[PDB]
Design an enzyme around this catalytic site. Structure first.
Site, PDB file in Angstrom:
ATOM      1  N   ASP A 197       0.786  -1.216   0.000  1.00 59.48           N
ATOM      2  CA  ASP A 197       0.000   0.000   0.000  1.00 59.48           C
ATOM      3  C   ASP A 197       0.827   1.281   0.000  1.00 59.48           C
ATOM      4  O   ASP A 197       1.824   1.396   0.712  1.00 59.48           O
ATOM      5  CB  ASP A 197      -0.942  -0.011   1.203  1.00 59.48           C
ATOM      6  CG  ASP A 197      -1.760   1.257   1.314  1.00 59.48           C
ATOM      7  OD1 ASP A 197      -2.645   1.484   0.463  1.00 59.48           O
ATOM      8  OD2 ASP A 197      -1.518   2.041   2.255  1.00 59.48           O
ATOM      9  N   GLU A 233       1.217  -0.569  -5.107  1.00 56.40           N
ATOM     10  CA  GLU A 233       0.263   0.409  -5.571  1.00 56.40           C
ATOM     11  C   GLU A 233       0.954   1.739  -5.818  1.00 56.40           C
ATOM     12  O   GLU A 233       1.264   2.478  -4.886  1.00 56.40           O
ATOM     13  CB  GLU A 233      -0.862   0.612  -4.576  1.00 56.40           C
ATOM     14  CG  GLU A 233      -1.840   1.672  -5.047  1.00 56.40           C
ATOM     15  CD  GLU A 233      -2.369   2.531  -3.932  1.00 56.40           C
ATOM     16  OE1 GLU A 233      -1.729   2.604  -2.864  1.00 56.40           O
ATOM     17  OE2 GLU A 233      -3.426   3.158  -4.124  1.00 56.40           O
TER      18      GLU A 233
HETATM   19 CL   LIG Z   1      -4.597  -1.123  -5.866  1.00 53.07          CL
END
Ligand SMILES: [Cl-]
Ligand SMILES: [Ca+2]
Length: 496
Positions: A197, A233
């Site tokens: 993340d 990401e």
């Molecule tokens: Cl994602």
């Protein structure tokens, strides 16, 4: 790291957004395993801060307070059970790793946390880890406000606070090690990989330093020497200071250009036409295919104001959504992730959904169970796109054509296109305001094929459209612009 580690032949993963562990365990056995899904991306399994205003938003889970496997989705026992049961039916588990930051610096000291752990964000104290003031980037950030004031400066983006969340000092080996220990516990349990993340907010090198400490995957299910699958990401739509390519050495990267551009093309905005998709992929300025993780929408941008904005297609636009998803699953570019959402009361105020914070279906904060209806639909306001026939069958299609090259492209110069995957599958789309009726070369051996979009092959029959393919490989496709699903797909395994 670039290899998904899915069971051979399985080519996609589903994001069971906000589902409970017990529900995912059941879904693996009753659906995902039998239906050929490669794996599941779960919501952050580590403890988070409790946000009571708004009432339990989906985003509170991106504000960590410790690494205890204790959340609204369940506890460590439930987590372990799920990972085991899913691995046992050939469905992998990928954890959403929130390692760039802890909770918001403005949160109050207390125990309003999903597991009762105490924390004092103002004094930067996280006793359950433990982390103290010297484990944060407060000193590194050269911004007056301490926040990311300019995304044009890669230092602010990486060392300053993202929307006020306490930024971890990832250059520090103590921090790198606390995180590695967390991830390692997960790997040992049986997890196959991670979604890192907020990668754009960490230095590529700090991520690598952390990844180096990772264990090989559990040999109960994986071959010895298996490295976990990593997909970071990184939102980069081009024209930005930080680029996706900077992260290519750590593993795959999320290609947000993919969903934003396909959305624009299928909605026929900005003068975009489906016939333009002939050179889709690297031809459109996308990252190398073997580095990309692609999707039509994700948990964040499906809420309207993410990467791609309003052009992103979601389940709310079911008909076009299925065309986009169908296109993605047929095309050979990237590794695919299918979204599985829950519905909520949207409320637009000046073109902004004021209810986008709404958490999963619940009874006074407690997440509702996923109920399956007789028609295979879900109850309790869980959308279950992965259960829609058009989607589940295209997931299967991808497995079937796996490895076959892009072939036999055809377009009418506007919004009617078709292409195949070697001699294993063929798909036709009619996104024009007029009728499609043409005989096309499919590349498949003659025979009668069941269209997997309108129906299924049941025994020696089809429940929907049947397509007769001559020995020379040609077949006629008739699709009305008013067809509920304006596309047809056939493959080696839908042949009668
Ligand atoms: Cl994602
Ligand atoms: Ca950071």
């Amino acid at each position: 790291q670039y290899a998904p580690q899915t069971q051979s032949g399985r080519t996609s993963i589903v994001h069971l957004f906000e589902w409970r562990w017990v529900d995912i365990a059941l879904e693996c056995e009753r659906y995902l395993g039998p239906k050929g899904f490669g794996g599941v991306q779960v919501s952050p399994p580590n403890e988070n801060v409790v946000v009571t205003n708004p009432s339990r938003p989906w985003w509170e889970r991106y504000q960590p307070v410790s690494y205890k496997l204790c959340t609204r989705s369940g506890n460590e026992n439930e987590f372990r059970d799920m990972v085991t049961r899913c691995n046992n039916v050939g469905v992998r588990i990928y954890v959403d790793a929130v390692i760039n930051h802890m909770c918001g610096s403005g949160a109050a000291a207390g125990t309003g946390t999903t597991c009762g752990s105490y924390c004092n964000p103002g004094s930067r104290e996280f006793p359950a880890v433990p982390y103290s003031a010297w484990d944060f980037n407060d000193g590194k950030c050269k911004t007056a406000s301490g926040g990311i004031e300019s995304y044009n400066d890669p230092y602010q983006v990486r060392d300053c606070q993202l929307v006020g969340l306490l930024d971890l000092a990832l250059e520090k080996d103590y921090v790198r090690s606390m995180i590695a220990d967390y991830l390692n516990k997960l790997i040992d349990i049986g997890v196959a990989g991670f979604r890192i993340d907020a990668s754009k907010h960490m230095w590529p090198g700090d991520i690598k330093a952390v990844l180096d400490k990772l264990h090989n995957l559990n040999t109960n299910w994986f071959p010895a020497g298996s490295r976990p699958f990593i997909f970071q990401e990184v939102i980069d739509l081009g024209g930005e200071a930080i680029s996706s390519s900077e992260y290519f050495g750590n593993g795959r990267v999320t290609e947000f250009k993919y969903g934003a551009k396909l959305g624009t093309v299928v909605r026929k905005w900005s003068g975009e036409k489906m016939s333009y998709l002939k050179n889709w992929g690297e031809g459109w300025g996308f990252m190398p295919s073997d580095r990309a993780l692609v999707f039509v929408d994700n948990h964040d941008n499906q809420r309207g104001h993410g990467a791609g904005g309003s052009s992103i297609l979601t389940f709310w636009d079911a008909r076009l959504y299925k065309v986009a998803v169908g296109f993605m699953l047929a095309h050979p570019y990237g590794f695919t992730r299918v979204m599985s959402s829950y519905r909520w009361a949207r409320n637009f105020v000046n073109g902004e959904d004021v209810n986008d914070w709404i958490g999963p279906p619940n009874n006074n904060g407690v997440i509702k169970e996923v109920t399956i209806n007789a028609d295979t639909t879900c109850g309790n306001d869980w959308v279950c796109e992965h259960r829609w026939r058009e989607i589940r069958n295209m997931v299967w299609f991808r497995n079937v054509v796996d490895g076959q090259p892009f072939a036999n492209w055809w377009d009418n110069g506007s919004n009617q296109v078709a292409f195949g995957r070697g001699n294993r599958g063929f798909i036709v789309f009619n996104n024009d305001d007029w009728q499609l009726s043409s005989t096309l070369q499919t590349g498949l051996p003659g025979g009668t094929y069941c269209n997997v979009i309108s129906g299924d092959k049941v025994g020696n029959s089809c429940t929907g459209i049947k397509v007769y393919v001559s020995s020379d490989g040609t077949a006629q496709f008739s699709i009305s612009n008013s067809a509920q699903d304006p596309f047809i797909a056939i493959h080696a395994e839908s042949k009668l």
